[model samples]
Target: MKNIGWMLRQRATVSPRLQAYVEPSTDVRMTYAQMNALANRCADVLTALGIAKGDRVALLMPNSVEFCCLFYGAAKLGAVAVPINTRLAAPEVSFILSDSGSKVVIYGAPSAPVIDAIRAQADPPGTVTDWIGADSLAERLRSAAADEPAVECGGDDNLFIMYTSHPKGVVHTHESVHSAASSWASTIDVRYRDRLLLPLPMFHVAALTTVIFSAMRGVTLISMPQFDATKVWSLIVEERVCIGGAVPAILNFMRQVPEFAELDAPDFRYFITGGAPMPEALIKIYAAKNIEVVQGYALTESCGGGTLLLSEDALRKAGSAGRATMFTDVAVRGDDGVIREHGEGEVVIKSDILLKEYWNRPEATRDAFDNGWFRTGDIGEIDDEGYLYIKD
Candidate 1:
C-alpha cells in the first residue's frame, strides 16, 4: 500500500475538480488549487529550514486551516508531524516536545506561553523554532516562495508519532498508519461530497486520521474552536454539514442544548463518535433529527478508526462498540494467551493499522504488545451476533 503522504498526493491529482473546504473561522476558503498551493508552501518552508525526511516537527495548535496546511506540508517534505494536545499542562507539553526529538514547535498565542514556559524549564537542544500566532503566520509563509521538491517516502519510512496516555510508552508505525489510511480510503464510504465536523484537536486520533485524511479525499473539513451544543446546532443548520466526528461527551452536550430541539439538521446525515462510550440517550436524540449516530472503538496506536458501530445495529446491541474494521483483526483474548470465543477476556487487536513502537521507551513498548497482538486493556465481551461490546 502507498504511504499516507502519497495518498494525499494521489487525491489532489485525481479529483482536481472538487471544492476542497469551508472553514468557519475565516472568510477564506480554499479550492483544490489553493489547498495544493499552501501545502506546497509548507513543504517549501520545511525544506528551507533544513528539516529533512523522517525529522519530527512538533505542532501545538487548534484545529484550523493552518493546522491542515502544516500537516500536509510536512507530509510533502517527508517529515513527521507530531501534534501535541493543546490542553496539556506545561510538563505534559515538555515531555512530548523532548520525546519526539522535535526540530521545532508551532503554536499560537493561546498555547505559546505554555510552550515558552516549558522551553524555559527544559530547553530542547538544537535551534527551537516557533510559530507564535495566526496573524504573523502569513508573513512567515510569504518568507518562502522558492518551491521545494517533494520527498518520496516508502511504506517503511517513519512519518509521525502519536503518544498515548499510558506510561507504557505505547506507539505505532508509519507503515501501520499508511495501511490504515489506505484501507480506510478503499473501504470506508466517506465521500468527497460529505462535510466533516471536527470538534476536537487533531492530536486526538479520531479527528486527525479522519478529518486530516479527508484532505486526501478532497472532503470539506469544517471545524469549530470547541463544541458548544447551541453553536453546533447553528453550524449544522447553516453549513449543511452532514457528518459530525467527535467524542461521546461532546455529543451528549449537543443533545442537551435546548436550541437543538428547534433546529432541523436535514443535511446532518451521520455522526461518528469515538474516544469513549456514547450515551444511548444522545443516540436517540440525534436519530430524531434524522442523524444516525455511528460509534467506533480505537486507540492512538490503531491509527484511529478501527471498529465502526453502524447505526442500524446501534439500538439492538445498545452498548456494543460493534465489529472490527474491514482490515483489522479485533478480538478478545483470554489470559491463556490466545483469542477467546465471544463473551470474555481483554479486547485485543492485531492489525496493519497498529503502530511500530514507542520513540525511546522499549520497556514500555514491550509490555504493550502481547505475542503478536496489541493488548487493548479495555474489558469487553462479544455477543453471538458477532458484535463486540466494551464494558469498562
Candidate 2:
C-alpha cells in the first residue's frame, strides 16, 4: 500500500536492535524493534477505540517517546496525525481541536489543565469522543497486541494536519512526507552511523519531518523535550551527536554558555538552523571553531526546508538561503505572474514537499496559489550565480 509507516517496519526488520530514539530527559532509549513494537501497540489501541482509516488522531504534548509512538501509530492505520503546539493557550487549543475534526485527542498529563479548561467551556467538535491521557494510553498499549496492524493506504492518502501560527491546518500526504524525508536525508548527507540532537519542538515542521528522515536512514535521534543551552552542550559531548538542529535564537543562546568554547564534539559535522534568517555573525562564530552552520528556509506549508545553504556556501554566501533543493523548483514571480530574473517579488515554490491544502479552507487554499505556484509571502531574489537572498 506504500504507507509511510512501512518504512519503520522495514527498519525494524533490517536492524532490530539498532538504537532509534533516546529521550535524555527520562534516560529512556528505544531500539528500532522496540520503537516499532510500541507503535504497533498504539495502532491496536486506536483500532480498539473504533478509530478507522482516514480518521484524525490529534496529539498535544511535549516531545517524548510516547509522541513518536502515537504519531507513527496513526500512520500505520492510515489515519491522519494532527500534532498541536503545546504552548498554545486554552482558547487556541480549543480552536484546533474543533477545527481539525479529530476523532480522538491524546494529550500528556502536563496539558490536562488546558484540556480541562477547554472542555469546561464547551465540548470542542471532536473532544466529545475519547480523550486519552499519555499515561493512560501507555496502559492501553500494554494490553494491546504488539503485531503491526497493517492498513492499506496509498501514497496520496492524508498523513498529517499540522497547525501553524495562522491556526490553519496544513495537510500533508504520505507521499509528500516520504519524498521530503528522502530528499532531506540525501541533502543533509545523513548516514546510518550519525546521531542527531533534536531539541526543537516536534510540533514544528523541521523537527517533525527531520525525525522521519532519521527513521528512513536508520539514524539515532536524541530527543529533548525542550531546548536548554547548557544541557545541549553536555548532550553533544556525551552522546557524540553528529548533527544538531536549532533556530538562530537558540544558536545564539548556546554561544553564551561558558562551556560552549571548550566543549568537545568530535563527531559533530555541522548544525542546521531554520525558521528565521541565519545571522552572519552566528555562522562566523561557528566557523572559528571549525564547525559548519548551514542555513535553510521553508514555511509550514512546505513540509520542511525547500532550500539549503550547503556547508561549502556557509561563509561564501553568508546571507543567502542558497539554491532550490533537488526536489523543489523555486522562483521569484512579479505581479504579471512571470518569473523575475534578478529583481524581487514574491518567492514561489513548486514541489511535492508542499502541503496538499489548508484543510477545510478552500478560499485560503485558492488564494495561496497562483496558477499552481505556491506563493511564499517573503520577498526574495535569485542571483545569476543561483543563490537566493531573502529581502524580507
Candidate 3:
C-alpha cells in the first residue's frame, strides 16, 4: 500500500494490458507492465550512477514518460526523488538542489542551459556527482536490465522532498502519500481506464498525487510536453480524457479557443482545479457548457490532499473549496485560538496525510504545527454548512 514502485507492480500484475500512460501528440502509450519495466530500467540506470537507499536523485524534466519512470525508479531504489521546477531561475534551482542534498541531476534537453550554468560553477549546488543528459539517459534506459531493484522501502520511509515556498525540501513519508492517493481514489470516483490529463508540470504536488492515484486505481495518465492551451484542449478531445487538472489561468486560455465552444467530449467528466481562486465568470461559462469545474484547496505540506468541491456542490458552493476530503480533518482557528467551524482564521489541519517534516529544518517543522494541528498558513473561514472559503 505504501510503496509507489510496488503499487505500480501490483497494478501491472492485475491489469498489465490496460493502458497506464499516454502522450497522443508523440504517439506514445504504455501499459502497466510496460511502464513498470521502464521504471525498473530507470532504477538500473540510477544504480549504475551510484544512487542507493535514502540517496537523492533529482529530475528537471517536463511531463513525459521518462519523468514518470524515473520517479518510480527512485522509489524502487528507496531513494528520494526530487523533481525540480524547470521554470525556476537558476538560483532557485540551485537552492532546491542544494537544500535537497541531491547527488545526481537528470534533465531533459530544454533544461540544458541551466544545467550548463550549474555545471560551469567550480562548486555546484550539492554533491551532484552525476549530471545525466536526455540522450545518455535514453541510451541507458534502452540497454539497462529491467529486473526490479527489490529494495525494502515504503511504509514510513520518506518518499519525496518536494520544494515549496521558502523553498525548503518538504519531506513526505510513504504512508503520507499512500493515504492521500487512496483518499483521491475514492473521492474522485476514479474508474479503471479513466484518462486523466494533468496539464501542469509534474514538479508540483497536484501532478504527483494524481499520478499516484492513477497507478493505484488503473487510471491512464495523459502527459503533455508542456501546456499549450489549444493543443491541450485538442488532446482532451482526441484522447477522450474523462478527467483533467487545470488552474483558472489555463481554463481562461482554453475557453477562448473556438473548439472549446464546440466541445463534443462525450467521455469528459469534470476538471479538477485549484492553486488559485477560480474566476466566478469562468465558472458560469463552464456551467453553461454543461461542464463541471471542481475546485480544491491544498498545499505541498498536506500531500496535496484537502477539501474538494464535488460537481454536485460546484454551483451550490460556488466559491468554496468544499468540505474536507475523506482522509483529512480541517478546521478554522480565529484570534480566540481554537479550531472551530464558524470564524475566519488560519486554516489548521490534522491528518495522516500531512508531510513528515521540512527536511533538516527542525524549527520550521515545529512551528508549522500547534498542538496536533498543522497550520495551513492561509486564513480561511468555514461556513455553517462546512465548506471552506479562503480569504482573498
Candidate 4:
C-alpha cells in the first residue's frame, strides 16, 4: 500500500476546480490543483535546501496556508513534519526543538522571533535550517517550479513526529495519517461542493486531520489562526461552509453565542468536534438547524479522527463518541494492562494508521503499546451498539 496521497489523486482528477482552502480574509480560495501545486513547490524548495527523504522539519505557526504547504511538502518528500504548539513559552519551546532534532523549521511572521530565540538556546537542531515569515512564506516557494512531481511514500515511512499532551513525544507515520484520511472520507459524506469551516490550530491532530482529509477528498476549507466562536459563525454564514471542525469548548461557545442562532448558514450539514467531549447541549441546537454534529474522539497518536459518533444516533448516543472508524480497531483494557471485555477501561487501538515509533523514546513507545495496540490512555466504555463513550 502507498501513502494517502495515492488515493487523493482521484479527487484532484475528478474536480480540480473544487475549492480546498478559504483564509480568514475570506478572499483566499485554493483549488485542489492549486493546493497540490503549492505542496509540490514546497517539496522542490526543501529538496533544494538539501533536506532529503527521512529528514525531519518543525513547523511553528498558527494554522495557515504555509502550514498546509510545508506539511504536505514533507509528506511528498518522505520527510517528517513536527507540529510545535504555538502556545508554548520560549523555554518550553526550546526543549521540544532540542528534543525532536528538527532540521528545518517554518514559522509564521509573528512566530519567527520565537523560533529564533528558541533556536539560539538549543544547539544541534539536526539540520541546517532557516526560518521564513508568513508573507514571504509561500512567495518564496510559489516561484519554484509548479510542475514538480510528488515524492513517493511507503506505507511504513514516518511522516509526522508530533508531541502528545504529555512531555513524551509520539510519532505518527504516513500510513497512519493516510489511513485516517481514508476512514474519515468513508465515515463522512464529504463532496466537492462542501466547504469545511476549519479554525483549530494546525499543531493539533484534530485540525491537522482536516487538511489531510480535505486534500484527499478535494473538499474546501476555511482557516483561522485559532478557533473563534463569533468569527466562526460569521464565516459559516458568508462562505456557505458545509462542514466544520471544532473542539468541545468551541462548540459550546458557538451554541451560546447569539449569532449562532440568529445568522443561519444551512449549507453546514456536518460538523466534526473533538479534542474533548461535546458539550451535549450543542447537539440539540445544531440538529434543529438541520446540522449533524459528529463527535470525533482520537488522540495525536492516531493521526487525528479515530472513533466517530454518527448523525443518526447523534441524539441517542448523546454522550458517546461512537465506534472506531473503518481503518481502526479499538480495545478496552484494565489497569492490569490486560484487555478488558465489554467494560469501561482504557482505550487501546490497533490500526494501519498507527505511528511508526516515538521520535527518540524507545522505552516510552514500548510502554505505550500492549502486544501491538497503542494505549490511548483514555477511559471509555463500549456500549451494546458498539459505540464508545469516553470519560477522562
**Candidate 1, 1-392: lDDT as tens digits:** 35555555566677765656666756656666567667777777766666788787777887676787777777767788887788888888777766677886778668978866776773543445553455566677887663535466756666678877733233434577666765565555687667777777777766777755576667776777666676888887777787887677777777778887677778888877784656677777777878787787888878885677778877777877878877887888887877865768899888888878877888767887998888878888877877887877
RMSD of 4: 2.3
Q: What is the lDDT ranking, best to worst?
A: 3, 2, 4, 1
Winner by lDDT: 3
Ten consecutive residues with minimal summed lDDT in candidate 3? Answer: 334-343
Segments of candidate 2 deviating more than 4 angstroms: 340-343
Query: In model 1, which residue pairs have backbone atoms overlapping below 3 Å?
Result: 172-355, 172-356, 173-355, 173-356
List where candidate 1 sits over 4 angstroms from the true fold.
Answer: 122-136, 146-148, 166-174, 182-189
Q: Which lDDT value does model 2 have at 279?
A: 74
Can you tell me which runs of candidate 4 are displaced by over 4 Å? 4-10, 24-26, 122-128, 135-139, 335-341
RMSD vs true structure, all candidates:
2.3, 1.4, 1.4, 2.3
Per-model lDDT:
0.72, 0.85, 0.86, 0.75
**What residue pairs are clashing in model 4?**
176-353
Cα-based TM-score, every candidate: 0.92, 0.97, 0.97, 0.91
Better of 1 and 2 by TM-score: 2
With a 3 Å backbone cut-off (N, CA, C), the pairs that clash in candidate 3 are: none
Q: Supply the global lDDT for candidate 1.
A: 0.72
TM-score of 1: 0.92
lDDT digits (tens) for residues 4-50 of candidate 2: 78888999999899999988778989999999999888888988887
